[PDB]
mmCIF file of C-alpha atoms in Angstrom:
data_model
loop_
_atom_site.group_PDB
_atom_site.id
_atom_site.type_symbol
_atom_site.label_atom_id
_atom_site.label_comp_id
_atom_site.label_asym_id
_atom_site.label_seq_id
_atom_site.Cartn_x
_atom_site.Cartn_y
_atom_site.Cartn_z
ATOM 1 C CA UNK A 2 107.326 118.614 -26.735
ATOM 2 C CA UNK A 3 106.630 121.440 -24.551
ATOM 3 C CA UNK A 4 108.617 124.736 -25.621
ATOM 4 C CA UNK A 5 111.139 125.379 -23.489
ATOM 5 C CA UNK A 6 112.336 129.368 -23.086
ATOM 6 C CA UNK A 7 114.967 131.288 -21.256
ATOM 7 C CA UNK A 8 115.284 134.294 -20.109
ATOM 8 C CA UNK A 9 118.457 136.141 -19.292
ATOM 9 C CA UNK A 10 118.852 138.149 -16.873
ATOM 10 C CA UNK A 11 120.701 141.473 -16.026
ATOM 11 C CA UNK A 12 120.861 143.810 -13.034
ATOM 12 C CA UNK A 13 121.820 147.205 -13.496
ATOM 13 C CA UNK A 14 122.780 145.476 -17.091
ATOM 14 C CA UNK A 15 125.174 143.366 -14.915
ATOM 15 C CA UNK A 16 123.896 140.023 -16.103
ATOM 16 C CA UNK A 17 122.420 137.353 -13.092
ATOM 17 C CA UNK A 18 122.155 134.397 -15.022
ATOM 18 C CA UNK A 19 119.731 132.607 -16.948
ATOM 19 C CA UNK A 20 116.358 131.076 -15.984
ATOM 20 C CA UNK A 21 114.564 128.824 -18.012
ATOM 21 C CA UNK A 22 110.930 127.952 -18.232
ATOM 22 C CA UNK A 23 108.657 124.943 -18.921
ATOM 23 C CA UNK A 24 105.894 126.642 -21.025
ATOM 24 C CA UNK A 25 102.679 123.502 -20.875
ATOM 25 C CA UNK A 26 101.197 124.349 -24.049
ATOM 26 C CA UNK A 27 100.143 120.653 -23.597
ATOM 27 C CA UNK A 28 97.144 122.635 -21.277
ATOM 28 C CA UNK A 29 97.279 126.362 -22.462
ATOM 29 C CA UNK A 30 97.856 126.186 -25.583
ATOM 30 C CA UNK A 31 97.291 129.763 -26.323
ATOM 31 C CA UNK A 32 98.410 131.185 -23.309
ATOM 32 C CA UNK A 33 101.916 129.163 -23.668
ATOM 33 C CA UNK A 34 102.661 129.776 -27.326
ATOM 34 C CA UNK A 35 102.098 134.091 -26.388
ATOM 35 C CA UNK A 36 104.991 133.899 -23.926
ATOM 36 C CA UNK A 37 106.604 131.538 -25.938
ATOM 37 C CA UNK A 38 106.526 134.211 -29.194
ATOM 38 C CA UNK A 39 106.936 137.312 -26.928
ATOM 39 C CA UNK A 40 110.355 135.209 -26.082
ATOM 40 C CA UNK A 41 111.193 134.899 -28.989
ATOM 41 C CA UNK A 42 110.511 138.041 -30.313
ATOM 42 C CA UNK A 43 109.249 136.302 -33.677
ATOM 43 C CA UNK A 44 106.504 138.551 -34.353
ATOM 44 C CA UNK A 45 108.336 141.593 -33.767
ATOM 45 C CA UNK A 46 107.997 142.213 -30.553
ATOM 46 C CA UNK A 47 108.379 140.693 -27.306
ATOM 47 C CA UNK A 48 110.397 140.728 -23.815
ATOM 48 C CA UNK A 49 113.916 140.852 -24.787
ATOM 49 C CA UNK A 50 115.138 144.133 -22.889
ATOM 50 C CA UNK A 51 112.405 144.908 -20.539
ATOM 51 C CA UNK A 52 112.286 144.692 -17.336
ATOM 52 C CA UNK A 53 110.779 143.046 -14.041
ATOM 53 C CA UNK A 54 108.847 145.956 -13.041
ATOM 54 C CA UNK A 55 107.338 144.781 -9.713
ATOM 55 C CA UNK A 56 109.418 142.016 -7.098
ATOM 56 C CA UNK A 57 107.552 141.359 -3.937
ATOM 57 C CA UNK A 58 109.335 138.801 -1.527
ATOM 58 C CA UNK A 59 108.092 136.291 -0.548
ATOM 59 C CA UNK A 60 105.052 136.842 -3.220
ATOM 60 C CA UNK A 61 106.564 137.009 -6.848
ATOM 61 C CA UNK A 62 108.045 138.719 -9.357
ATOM 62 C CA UNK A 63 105.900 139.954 -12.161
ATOM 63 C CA UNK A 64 107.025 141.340 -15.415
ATOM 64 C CA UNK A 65 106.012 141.501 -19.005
ATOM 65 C CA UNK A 66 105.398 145.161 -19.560
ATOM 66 C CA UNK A 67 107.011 145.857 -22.450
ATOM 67 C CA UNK A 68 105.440 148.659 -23.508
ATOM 68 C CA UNK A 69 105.307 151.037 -19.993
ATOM 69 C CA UNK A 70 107.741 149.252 -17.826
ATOM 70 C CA UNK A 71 105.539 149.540 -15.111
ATOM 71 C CA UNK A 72 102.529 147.365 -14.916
ATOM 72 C CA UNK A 73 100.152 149.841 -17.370
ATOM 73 C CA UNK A 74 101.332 148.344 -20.558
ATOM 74 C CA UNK A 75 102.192 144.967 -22.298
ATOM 75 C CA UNK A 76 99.774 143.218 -25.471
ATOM 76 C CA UNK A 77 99.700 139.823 -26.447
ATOM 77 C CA UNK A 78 100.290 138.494 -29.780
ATOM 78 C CA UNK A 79 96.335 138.361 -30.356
ATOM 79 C CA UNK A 80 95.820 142.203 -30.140
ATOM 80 C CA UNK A 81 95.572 143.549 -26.677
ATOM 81 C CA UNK A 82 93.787 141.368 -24.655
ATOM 82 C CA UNK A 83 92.877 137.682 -24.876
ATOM 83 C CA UNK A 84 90.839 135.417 -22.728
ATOM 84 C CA UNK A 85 91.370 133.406 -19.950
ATOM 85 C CA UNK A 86 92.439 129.975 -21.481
ATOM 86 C CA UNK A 87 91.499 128.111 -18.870
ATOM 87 C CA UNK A 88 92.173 127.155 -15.199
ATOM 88 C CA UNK A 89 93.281 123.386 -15.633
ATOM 89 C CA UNK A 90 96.823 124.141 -13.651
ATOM 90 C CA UNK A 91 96.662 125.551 -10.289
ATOM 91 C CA UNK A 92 99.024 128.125 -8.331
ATOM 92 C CA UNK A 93 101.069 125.082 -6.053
ATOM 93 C CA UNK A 94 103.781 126.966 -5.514
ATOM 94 C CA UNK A 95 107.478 128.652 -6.216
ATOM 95 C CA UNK A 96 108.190 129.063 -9.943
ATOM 96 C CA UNK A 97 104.407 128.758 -11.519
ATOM 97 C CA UNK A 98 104.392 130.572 -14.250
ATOM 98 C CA UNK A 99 101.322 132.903 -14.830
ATOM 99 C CA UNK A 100 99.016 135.957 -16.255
ATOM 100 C CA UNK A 101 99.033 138.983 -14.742
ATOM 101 C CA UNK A 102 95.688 140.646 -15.200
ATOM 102 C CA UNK A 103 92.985 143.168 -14.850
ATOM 103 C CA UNK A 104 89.615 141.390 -14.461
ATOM 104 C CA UNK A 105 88.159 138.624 -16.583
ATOM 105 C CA UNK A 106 90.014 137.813 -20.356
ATOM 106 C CA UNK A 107 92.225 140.344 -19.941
ATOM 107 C CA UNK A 108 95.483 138.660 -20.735
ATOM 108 C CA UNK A 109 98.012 140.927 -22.280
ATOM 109 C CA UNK A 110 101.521 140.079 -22.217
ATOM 110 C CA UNK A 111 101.915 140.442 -18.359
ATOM 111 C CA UNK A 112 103.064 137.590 -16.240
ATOM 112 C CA UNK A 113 104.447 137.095 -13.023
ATOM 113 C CA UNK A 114 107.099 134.280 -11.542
ATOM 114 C CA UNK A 115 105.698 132.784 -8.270
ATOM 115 C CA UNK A 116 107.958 132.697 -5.216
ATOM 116 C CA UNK A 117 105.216 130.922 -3.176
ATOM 117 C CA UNK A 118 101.954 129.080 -2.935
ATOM 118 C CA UNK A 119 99.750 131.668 -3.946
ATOM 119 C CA UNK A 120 96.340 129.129 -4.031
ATOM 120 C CA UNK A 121 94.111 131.938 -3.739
ATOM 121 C CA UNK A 122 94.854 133.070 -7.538
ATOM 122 C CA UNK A 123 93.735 130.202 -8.421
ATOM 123 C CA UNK A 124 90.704 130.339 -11.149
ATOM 124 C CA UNK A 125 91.791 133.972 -11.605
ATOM 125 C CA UNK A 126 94.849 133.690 -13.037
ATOM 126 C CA UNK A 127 96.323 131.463 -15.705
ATOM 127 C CA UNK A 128 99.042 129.050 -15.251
ATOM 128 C CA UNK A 129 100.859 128.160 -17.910
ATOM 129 C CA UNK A 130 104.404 127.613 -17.114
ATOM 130 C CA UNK A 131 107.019 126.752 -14.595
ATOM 131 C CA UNK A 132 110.582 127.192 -13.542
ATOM 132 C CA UNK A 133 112.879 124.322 -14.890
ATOM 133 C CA UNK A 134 115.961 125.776 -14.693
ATOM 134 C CA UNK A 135 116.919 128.558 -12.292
ATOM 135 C CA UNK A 136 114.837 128.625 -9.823
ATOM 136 C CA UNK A 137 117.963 130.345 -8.016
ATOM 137 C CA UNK A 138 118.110 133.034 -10.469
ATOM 138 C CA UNK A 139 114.493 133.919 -9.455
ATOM 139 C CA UNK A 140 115.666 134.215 -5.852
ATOM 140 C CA UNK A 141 118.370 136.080 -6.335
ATOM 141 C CA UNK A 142 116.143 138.703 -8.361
ATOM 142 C CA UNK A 143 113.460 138.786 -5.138
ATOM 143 C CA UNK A 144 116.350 140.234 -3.232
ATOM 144 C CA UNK A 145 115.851 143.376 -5.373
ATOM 145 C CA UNK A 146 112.337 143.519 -4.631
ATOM 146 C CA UNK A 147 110.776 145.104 -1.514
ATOM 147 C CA UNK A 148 107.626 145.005 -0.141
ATOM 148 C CA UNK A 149 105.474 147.669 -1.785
ATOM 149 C CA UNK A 150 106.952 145.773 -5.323
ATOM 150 C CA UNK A 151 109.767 148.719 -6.119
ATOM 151 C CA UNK A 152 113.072 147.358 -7.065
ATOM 152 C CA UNK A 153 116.415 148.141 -5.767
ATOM 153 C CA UNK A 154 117.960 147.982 -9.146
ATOM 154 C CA UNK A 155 117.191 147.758 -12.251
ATOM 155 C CA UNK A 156 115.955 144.066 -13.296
ATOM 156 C CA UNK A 157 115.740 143.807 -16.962
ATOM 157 C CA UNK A 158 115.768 140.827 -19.298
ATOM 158 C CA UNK A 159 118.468 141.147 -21.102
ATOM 159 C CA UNK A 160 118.001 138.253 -23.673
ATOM 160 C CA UNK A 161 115.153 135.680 -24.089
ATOM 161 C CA UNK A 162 113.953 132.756 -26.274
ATOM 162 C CA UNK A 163 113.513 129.316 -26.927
ATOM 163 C CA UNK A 164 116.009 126.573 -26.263
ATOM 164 C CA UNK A 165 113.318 124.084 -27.281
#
C-alpha cells in the first residue's frame, strides 16, 4: 500500500539503470506523497530531468533541486517550504530515504539517498523512504561523487515515477 517510485538514471545522459524506492507514507504521510508527486510529475512539476547535484562517498547522494541544480533551489508541492512531519523513522543506514534541509520546517523538495548510517541526522531530518530496488545503482552513482560533493559527470534523472 505504500507507493512505490523509480527513478531512472543517466550519466552524461548515458542511462545507469533504475532505482526504485519504498516511499512509507504509512509514517510520513506528507512527506512521502511530495516525493511521490514530484515523481510523478502530476502537478506539473517534479524531478524528471534534474540532476544529483551533490555525491559524497561514503555519506550520500542528495538531489532534488529542480529548480537551481545545485542545492539553492527545489519547492514542495505545498508552496516552498513545509514542516518537519515527524521523526518516527530513524537514519539506520544505506538507502534511507530523506529531507534535505535548512533549519527547522524547511522541507522543500530536496532529499538525499543515504550510503551509510548517518544516526546523527536523526530528529533533524525526515525519513521517509528507502531503497527497494537498486541499491547498486546508488553505488554506482557515489563513484561520481568526490569528497567536497562535486560530481565527475553529470548525474541526472532521466525518468521518474510510480510503479505502485
Amino acid at each position: 500500500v505504500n507507493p512505490t517510485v523509480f527513478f531512472d538514471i543517466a550519466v552524461d545522459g548515458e542511462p545507469l539503470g533504475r532505482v526504485s524506492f519504498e516511499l512509507f507514507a504509512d509514517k510520513v504521510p506528507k512527506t512521502a506523497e511530495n516525493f511521490r508527486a514530484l515523481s510523478t510529475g502530476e502537478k506539473g512539476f517534479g524531478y524528471k530531468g534534474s540532476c544529483f547535484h551533490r555525491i559524497i562517498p561514503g555519506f550520500m547522494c542528495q538531489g532534488g533541486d529542480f529548480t537551481r541544480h545545485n542545492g539553492t533551489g527545489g519547492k514542495s508541492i505545498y508552496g516552498e517550504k513545509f514542516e518537519d512531519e515527524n521523526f518516527i523513522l530513524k537514519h539506520t543506514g544505506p538507502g534511507i530515504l530523506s529531507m534535505a534541509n535548512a533549519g527547522p520546517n524547511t522541507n522543500g523538495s530536496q532529499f538525499f539517498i543515504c550510503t551509510a548510517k548517518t544516526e546523527w541526522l536523526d530528529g533533524k531530518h525526515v525519513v521517509f523512504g528507502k531503497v527497494k530496488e537498486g541499491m547498486n545503482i546508488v553505488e554506482a552513482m557515489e563513484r561520481f561523487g568526490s569528497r567536497n560533493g562535486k560530481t565527475s559527470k553529470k548525474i541526472t534523472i532521466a525518468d521518474c515515477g510510480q510503479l505502485e
